[PDB]
UniProtKB/TrEMBL annotation, chain A:
GO terms for molecular function: structural constituent of ribosome. The keyword Ribosomal protein applies. This is Putative 60S ribosomal protein L39. It comes from Leishmania major. Mg(2+) binds at Y50. The lineage of its organism: Eukaryota, Discoba, Euglenozoa, Kinetoplastea, Metakinetoplastina. InterPro entries: Ribosomal_eL39, Ribosomal_eL39_CS, Ribosomal_eL39_dom_sf. One of its GO terms (cellular component) is cytosolic large ribosomal subunit. SUPFAM superfamilies: Ribosomal protein L39e. It comes from the Eukaryota. Keywords: Metal-binding, Ribonucleoprotein, Ribosomal protein. Pfam families: Ribosomal_L39. Belongs to the eukaryotic ribosomal protein eL39 family.
TrEMBL record, chain B:
One of its GO terms (biological process) is translation. Keywords: Ribonucleoprotein, Ribosomal protein. This is Putative 60S ribosomal protein L35. One of its GO terms (molecular function) is structural constituent of ribosome. It holds the Pfam family Ribosomal_L29.
TrEMBL record, chain D:
This is Putative ribosomal protein L1a. Belongs to the universal ribosomal protein uL4 family.
TrEMBL record, chain H:
Residues 160-179 are annotated as: Disordered. Residues 167-179 have a biased composition (Basic residues). It comes from Leishmania major. This is Ribosomal protein L15. Mg(2+) 2 binds at Q103.
Length: 50, 123, 55, 53, 53, 118, 81, 203, 51
RNA sequence: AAUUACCGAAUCUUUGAACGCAAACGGCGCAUGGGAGAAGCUCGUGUCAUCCCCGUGCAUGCCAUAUUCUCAGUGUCGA
RNA sequence: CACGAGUUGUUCGGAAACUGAGCACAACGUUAUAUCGUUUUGUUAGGAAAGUGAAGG
RNA sequence: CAGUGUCAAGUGGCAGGUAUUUGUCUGCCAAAGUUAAAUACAGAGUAGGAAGACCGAUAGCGAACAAGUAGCGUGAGCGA
RNA sequence: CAGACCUGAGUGUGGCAGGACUACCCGCCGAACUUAAGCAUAUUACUCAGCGGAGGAAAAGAAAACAACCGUGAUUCUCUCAGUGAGCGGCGAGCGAAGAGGGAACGAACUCGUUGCCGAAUCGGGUCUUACAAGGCCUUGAGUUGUGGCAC
């Protein structure tokens, strides 16, 4: 709905910014081990409930 | 880019003037970040930010040292702000000092003088 | 490294015939030898004021 | 002394067509309902654990 | 206030109860003129102060 | 003795010495001229922002999220020497604060935009 | 009936976020936290769950100040001339 | 000196004058709070023999406790298990009221150090003790060689660990030799010493 | 067994008085000096029903 | 030196025992010291009402103290 | 799925600023233990909880 | 040892492992206080070190990896 | 009349307590499963769970102690005493120590109260000696309802 505390709104904002793929140049570093974000979230799979 | 040796030579009024100039320069570089900017221009952001840190370090280090000397006089050291006092540890601040310890009664003091510990050998 | 100690007899009828080292010298023994107990405590002699010297 | 026993496992009992070995509680993971507390179970306690005395 | 009430009730109770002679002897005191003379003599022979000492 | 006219006793009124002002417990050096740079961060150059410059004499900025409209008006005067007649603010879904600043008719938003470097 | 139909009758929420510990364990009606007992001054700690104690103890976070004071102690509170 | 007369007088608590004085004092104490601060001790001789001195940094409090036996706090007086553990009213606390009073004062006032206490009065419902405390931040205390030992942090809340005279009394440390072998240095220490299994290397 | 209803009512809970609509306790005047020595005269203003 | 290692000088957002008052509110006070001020006043200056921003102090309890602070009591005296 | 964007208030809703069924900080009491009890039938607490209208020079 | 009742003596008192009364004998002097070392660290921590007839990725800590993480539960908790 | 003492308040100034950790250690509170081939005393156990409190260790500690000898001599710990011809126990299941002896450690001992002789010689606060001196000077401020000194 329309209502939410500002503190709640900021928590949702941070989760929106974290929901991104890994930059491509990360895979070219020496000794890299990362391929995908592995913490991607979708609104229909898992709920944050805050 | 400012050398630390030159900064310590400047006065407080001169330092504040330089701080404003570098702050203004950094703001103009943030505009370049939003639009398109040359790679050479964007490489100057980090040296500017570090120069600002050096100026603030010199100002704050001078200010603390002056106030410590100002409150060093016996008439004002009882009202020294708590941030300028030595930190140590909470328990160490409340512990007995070396002078408060080792206090002796008069009888104990005279006994120590009458029978001091000796150095001896056996053949 | 170790202070001087006296010689005592073990109690009970089972250890009557044995000898060992006691805690410290008695004030009567120190007086017989000609020593102040407080002074003797500073030159490496142990002092015990409880022992009785019954013989 | 704690290895292999750090779970809140319980037996399901008879009436379900499964063995009577204790099983991990909870849900949502691949280890939910798996066997526990046994020298024959994966992740379980060994038989006669070694001692220092 | 409570302390006012209690310090009055204590005097009332002390008057009401029965007082043994050892305590009662302190109620009967010396005459005013003799008390004044004794206090005058004591003040005449008062001890020295810190500055005087 | 004193005379009381109320059926219960209340605390009497006594002299009270006012508290003294202690030396300040914060000794960090702060500058007055630096503050305006913290309020205004950087402008926006999106398509919606560009339409407002030409058609409404309005500028768009990202500002400190804890600043209010009154402070934003003062910072605009101190940084760019322009007068703002109206400020509208919103907090974006990503957590940043955005301000639509309408300039007075005496100034031209397009001219100010060129000086900034848009 | 109990089961699937009754799952649609569940509205509202019993718990929200806690200001002190950050978990979704703050009881709205009773105004107290089921995880850290906020606003009581002390926190919950029970010996029948050592596993829960190890999840919340010192060292599971940042230790911003403890790292600094540990260095000063190891260097005997060194100071310049 | 005057001490002999005061001490001999306080050994006649059953005499008429002493009973009169104690009745007046008990009536007055009954209408006060549970904890009271005093300017001077009621029994100066006893306080001084227990360690009090008339100097800056010492203070005296009077603490009230309720008499009677302990009631076991179970719901509706219902116990479970073996019949041996079914008593609700006939059990007694394993710690004495003097220690209870000292612990109450110590828990209430955390900036002081408790030293000792003594019995002052008693009636049908209540008992009254006087507790001596010191302030460890006072310069007189910190510089006095006879009392400054209590400034050290190892003596913090020593009454909560049963280290006062009453605590020693109910721990049984009034006795030595064959009457205290199983409780020295403590019950738990003796229990560990007698129950741990010993494995020598070459056995 | 379980607790009987008559004993359960002693806890209070959902068995207390419904007093939201009530006007307050009904009582006489306070026995004061005027009532002890002379008399006081009052006027009846309203007559009402209480739930 | 956008190298590393160590450490004495510094910085250290919102909270939390959390302590000015509250709280699914980035909210609201008292005292004091500053800042900015397109009104009005005044000769682009100075000054500034309402509004706005910042620093510091302000929980409860207990101990000590007042160049000897201000008080209360049909408590005990005294003039 | 990827990249780039979008939420504008003196008057709209909330708070600032009401009271209700109710809650429980202080205070007091109790408990070996406060993490217990009382706290709107005009109303806390053996209970000294009011800090400024005018003044007056 | 604790609660309640009762409640002392005066160089006499306490202890001498079967209760009482009466004589000796031996040891010691309660009801106030401080105090290093030799001892513990059976699911602590800080700064450093040394090892093993141990395990070798279904083993060894739950975790050799962005592991108390992803995920589950209203919650206490559970947990790859 | 003013005033004084006693008992309580308000405010200013300088301080301290609440929280965290809790392996070991100190105080309280405190089970049942289990064994007895059943079970209630007993056992598990003066244990788990619960409530408090410190440290680098804690606690204990300078004889109202052992003994019954040709006597030993604060505390703590180790082997042994000893699974005991001790003792407790539906005398069943079971439970269960101390003195002595060989050792580790050890410069290990001191302080009040009381008694006798003194009696503010005491404490705090200002100020001055490079100094919040174990110092001088000044202080009614505290203190004679007793701080401090000298011998036991
Ligand atoms: K009175
Ligand atoms: K304490
Ligand atoms: K009066
Ligand atoms: Mg929601
Ligand atoms: Mg395993
Ligand atoms: Mg808006
Ligand atoms: Mg009771
Ligand atoms: Mg039971
Ligand atoms: Mg207690
Ligand atoms: Mg032993
Ligand atoms: Mg009702
Ligand atoms: Mg607050
Ligand atoms: Mg998508
Ligand atoms: Mg996007
Ligand atoms: Mg009621
Ligand atoms: Mg109401
Ligand atoms: Mg109210
Ligand atoms: Mg001790
Ligand atoms: Mg595999
Ligand atoms: Mg594995
Ligand atoms: Mg078992
Ligand atoms: Mg059986
Ligand atoms: Mg069987
Ligand atoms: Mg059975
Ligand atoms: Mg037992
Ligand atoms: Mg336990
Ligand atoms: Mg100790
Ligand atoms: Mg044998
Ligand atoms: Mg047993
Ligand atoms: Mg004397
Ligand atoms: Mg004396
Ligand atoms: Na029962
Ligand atoms: Na009503
Ligand atoms: Zn919480």
């Amino acid at each position: 709905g329309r209502f939410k505390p500002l503190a709640v709104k900021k928590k949702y904002a941070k989760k929106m910014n974290q929901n991104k793929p890994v930059p491509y140049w990360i895979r070219l570093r020496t000794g890299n081990r990362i391929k995908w974000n592995e913490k991607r979230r979708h609104w229909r799979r898992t709920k944050l409930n805050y | 880019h400012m050398k630390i040796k030159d900064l310590r030579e400047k006065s407080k009024d001169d330092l504040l003037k330089t701080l404003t100039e570098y702050k203004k320069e950094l703001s103009q570089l943030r505009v370049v970040q939003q639009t398109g900017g040359a790679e050479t221009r964007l490489g100057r952001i980090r040296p500017i930010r570090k120069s600002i840190a050096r100026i603030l370090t010199v100002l704050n280090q001078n200010e603390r040292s002056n106030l410590k000397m100002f409150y060093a006089d016996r008439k004002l050291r009882c009202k020294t702000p708590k941030v300028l006092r030595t930190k140590l540890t909470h328990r160490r601040r409340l512990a007995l000092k070396e002078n408060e310890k080792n206090r002796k009664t008069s009888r104990q003091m005279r006994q120590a003088h009458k029978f001091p510990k000796r150095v001896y050998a056996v053949k | 490294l170790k202070a001087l100690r006296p010689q005592v007899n073990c109690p009970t009828v089972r250890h009557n015939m044995k000898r060992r080292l006691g805690r410290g010298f008695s004030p009567a023994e120190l007086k017989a030898a000609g020593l102040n107990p407080q002074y003797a405590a500073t030159i490496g002699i142990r002092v015990d004021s409880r022992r009785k010297n019954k013989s | 002394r704690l290895s292999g026993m750090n779970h809140s496992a319980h037996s399901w009992g008879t009436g379900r067509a499964v063995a009577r070995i204790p099983r991990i509680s909870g849900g949502g993971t691949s280890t939910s309902g798996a066997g526990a507390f046994g020298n024959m179970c994966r992740g379980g306690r060994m038989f006669a654990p070694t001692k220092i005395f | 206030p409570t302390f006012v009430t209690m310090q009055r009730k204590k005097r009332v109770l002390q008057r009401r109860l029965k007082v043994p002679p050892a305590l009662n002897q302190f109620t009967k005191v010396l005459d005013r003129a003799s008390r004044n003379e004794a206090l005058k003599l004591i003040k005449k022979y008062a001890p020295e102060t810190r500055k005087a000492r | 003795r004193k005379s009381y006219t109320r059926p219960q006793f209340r605390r009497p009124h006594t002299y009270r010495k006012p508290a003294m002002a202690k030396p300040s417990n914060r000794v960090t050096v702060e500058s007055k001229d630096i503050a305006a740079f913290n309020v205004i961060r950087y402008p926006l150059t999106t398509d919606k922002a560009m339409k407002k410059i030409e058609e409404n004499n309005t500028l768009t900025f990202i500002v400190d999220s804890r600043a209010n409209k009154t402070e934003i008006k003062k910072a605009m005067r101190k940084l760019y020497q322009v007068k703002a007649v109206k400020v509208n603010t919103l907090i974006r879904p990503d957590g940043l604060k955005k301000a639509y600043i309408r300039l007075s008719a005496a100034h031209d938003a397009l001219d100010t935009a060129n000086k900034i470097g848009l | 009936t109990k089961g699937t139909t009754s799952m649609g009758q569940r509205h509202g929420r019993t718990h929200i976020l806690c200001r002190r510990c950050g978990r979704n364990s703050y009881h709205v009606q009773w105004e107290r936290c089921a995880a850290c007992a906020y606003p009581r001054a002390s926190r919950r700690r029970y010996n029948w769950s050592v596993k829960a104690i190890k999840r919340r103890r010192t060292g599971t976070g940042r230790c911003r100040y403890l790292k600094v004071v540990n260095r000063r102690i190891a260097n005997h509170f060194k100071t310049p001339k | 000196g005057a001490f002999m007369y005061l001490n001999e007088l306080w050994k006649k608590k059953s005499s008429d004058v002493m009973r009169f004085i104690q009745r007046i004092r008990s009536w007055e104490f009954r209408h006060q709070h549970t904890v009271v601060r005093l300017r001077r001790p009621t029994r100066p001789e006893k306080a001084r023999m227990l360690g009090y001195k008339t100097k800056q940094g010492f203070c005296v409090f009077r603490v009230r406790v309720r008499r009677g036996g302990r009631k076991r706090p179970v719901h509706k007086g219902i116990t479970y298990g073996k019949p041996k553990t079914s008593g609700v009213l006939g059990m007694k606390l394993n710690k004495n009221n003097q220690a209870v009073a000292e612990q109450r004062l110590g828990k209430r006032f955390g900036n002081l150090r408790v030293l000792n206490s003594y019995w002052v009065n008693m009636d049908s419902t209540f008992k009254w003790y006087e507790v001596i405390a010191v302030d460890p931040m006072c310069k007189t205390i910190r510089r006095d060689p006879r009392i400054n030992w209590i400034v050290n942090s190892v003596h913090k809340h020593r009454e909560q660990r049963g280290l006062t005279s009453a605590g020693r009394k109910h721990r049984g440390l009034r006795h030595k030799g064959h009457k205290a072998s199983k409780l020295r240095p403590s019950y738990r220490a003796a229990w560990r010493r007698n129950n741990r299994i010993v494995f020598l290397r070459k056995r | 067994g379980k607790t009987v209803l008559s004993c359960r009512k002693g806890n209070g809970s959902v068995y207390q008085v419904h007093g939201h609509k009530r006007l307050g306790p009904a009582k006489l005047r306070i026995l004061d000096y005027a009532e002890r020595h002379g008399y006081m005269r009052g006027v009846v203003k309203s007559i009402e029903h209480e739930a």
